Write a protein that binds this ligand. Structure first.
Ligand SMILES: [Ca+2]
Ligand SMILES: [Cl-]
Lengths: 174, 174, 174
């Protein structure tokens, strides 16, 4: 009989210990369930971040491409453009047209083509021209002396023609 | 009899099993504690990352605006600037002033305005001018022939005046 | 003997409950192992992301610097460049060379230097020049009248020289 109370005592002990284990298991289960939930949310956030960074890194590739493009175009303009402050002569590969005038050193040297001219006719003299030729004129009429005047006048008129033709070919006059 | 031999054996069995469960439960507690702690640190890191990515994406929005701005400015300059390498004629909506000279095909055509001129007086001859007019000069004096020289000289001088007037009006001479 | 069956009942209950806890522990172990595994993968992902944002933020500093660079260069070009659409006069600090021609208001005023000229010689007349000077020519030969004609011709020729010299110094003719 009292061998049996000793069995009753241990059964009660086991019962308390089993109940304690059950309670401990339940506490662990809930903690784990809570932890599992947080892992899912962490996974959701991290998957979001991974997708974001992929998008960010792709965007940065585009940004680098756009920067390279604009740096290249700026570089091209820098080497190709006519500057207002550069002192060394600048050359265009094209003709040039402007409004109303061309100036040198703040002073107009060339304006619009001047019209109203009738073009002179004849053969232009581009050859030797002696402007200091003195023409002898005697007390008496000498055909050769007046003929020298005639020759000299014709030379002058053909030189005028040469000058006029030069301006017309340039476009300074009509 | 064999009554209690069998119950004590099972009680000993239960005791060992309860203790085994207890030791296994405790091991789970340690592992779970470590895992819970790692979850806290991960959440801290992910929260940090979430803020970084928000900041980065805001920065990238600004970058795109700035890229838009500079690309637009470059585009406007591109269409508005005078190029040194384009072969087709370029036109300014303004007059132009340069230092010391204008050249065509690498050769100076126009320089600074030349001073020191006294303006000629008279009526410029813009009409017909025959540079090949020949002036007959005979063996003997003929009024009409010498008068033809006078007329031709007056014409020539008035044509010179017309040219000089053109140059002064352009600004090539003062 | 009335009492021992009651122990049989409780022992059976304990056996079932202990077995339930043992299995429950095993189930928790599996869940915990799964969670621990996911935590490791999460850590690898987060560690990757932590390094990524460091690289991205360094990149963004570089981007802002590059944006600063082009914005600065665009700004410099904008103030320095010759514009095709501005209406008010533009000035170059340099000489200018162009291809084939200069035009004003859509019409060519200056072309290439014209060659083939031999320089006229003499003393250029830059002084007073009266183009309306009339030369009297009488019925009979008069030296003073023809001498005045000679004087007028020399003046005309020397004025031509002055004009030609002006054109040559500009570079409009060789
Ligand atoms: Ca018993
Ligand atoms: Cl148990």
């Amino acid at each position: 009989q009292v061998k049996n109370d000793e069995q009753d005592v241990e059964l009660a002990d086991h019962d308390a210990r089993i109940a304690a284990n059950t309670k401990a298991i339940n506490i662990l289960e809930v903690r784990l369930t809570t932890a599992e939930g947080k892992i899912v949310v962490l996974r959701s956030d991290v998957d979001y971040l991974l997708d974001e960074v992929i998008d960010i890194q792709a965007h940065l590739v585009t940004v680098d491409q756009r920067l390279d493009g604009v740096e290249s175009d700026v570089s091209d303009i820098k080497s190709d453009y006519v500057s207002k402050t550069v002192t060394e002569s600048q050359s265009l590969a094209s003709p040039l047209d402007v409004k109303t005038s061309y100036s040198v050193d703040g002073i107009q040297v060339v304006g619009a083509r001047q019209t109203g001219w009738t073009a002179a006719t004849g053969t232009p003299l581009l050859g030797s021209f002696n402007a200091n030729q003195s023409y002898t004129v005697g007390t008496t009429y000498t055909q050769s002396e007046v003929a020298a005047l005639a020759t000299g006048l014709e030379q002058a008129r053909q030189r005028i023609l040469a000058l006029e033709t030069a301006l017309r070919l340039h476009g300074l006059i009509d």
